[PDB]
Amino acid sequence: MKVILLEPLENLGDVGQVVDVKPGYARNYLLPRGLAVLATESNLKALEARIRAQAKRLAERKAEAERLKEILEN
RNA sequence: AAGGGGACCAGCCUAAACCGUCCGGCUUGUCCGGGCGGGGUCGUGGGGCCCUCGGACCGAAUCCCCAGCCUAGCCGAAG
Ligand SMILES: [Mg+2]
Ligand SMILES: [Mg+2]
Ligand SMILES: [Mg+2]
Ligand SMILES: [Mg+2]
Ligand SMILES: [Mg+2]
Ligand SMILES: [Mg+2]
Ligand SMILES: [Mg+2]
Ligand SMILES: [Mg+2]
Ligand SMILES: [Mg+2]
Ligand SMILES: [Mg+2]
Ligand SMILES: [Mg+2]
Ligand SMILES: [Mg+2]
């Protein structure tokens, strides 16, 4: 069963990563303890749209810096 | 059972794509979810979106009126 980790779990996966676990593990351990969420279509988009937003506000930083490296350095 | 002969006869509304709006979720938006409205309903496949072209006739199974009908009755020839 595919789940999206909400946290880094040792010998499991990284936060935001999609891993495969047995249904019992997900239903009776991860989901109740807030450690993961079902890799459903609905929030596979939620993860995706946040990976997209994080990249958006990052490349905006690496370009509002360069526009300052423009004025300075000259 | 098909088929044939007859009785009767009638076909419609949705879900999803996509659009809009409201609400709340927290993991902040190009988000996800819930409601509502639009859109759509098909097998010659149909629909959505995007271009190009083109701009009155049907009509309920719903509501209204009426005829007709029922729930009392009446006239009715000639020793
Ligand atoms: Mg028959
Ligand atoms: Mg027949
Ligand atoms: Mg008959
Ligand atoms: Mg018929
Ligand atoms: Mg809001
Ligand atoms: Mg939804
Ligand atoms: Mg909605
Ligand atoms: Mg059609
Ligand atoms: Mg088609
Ligand atoms: Mg109807
Ligand atoms: Mg009499
Ligand atoms: Mg008499």
UniProtKB/Swiss-Prot annotation:
Keywords: Ribonucleoprotein, Ribosomal protein, RNA-binding, rRNA-binding. Signal peptide: none annotated. The keyword RNA-binding applies. GO terms for cellular component: ribonucleoprotein complex; ribosome. Binds to the 23S rRNA. Extends more that 50 Angstroms beyond the surface of the 70S ribosome. Belongs to the bacterial ribosomal protein bL9 family. GO terms for molecular function: rRNA binding; structural constituent of ribosome. The chain holds residues 1 to 74 of 148 of the full protein. This is Large ribosomal subunit protein bL9. The keyword Transmembrane helix does not apply. GO terms for biological process: translation. It comes from the Bacteria. Part of the 50S ribosomal subunit.
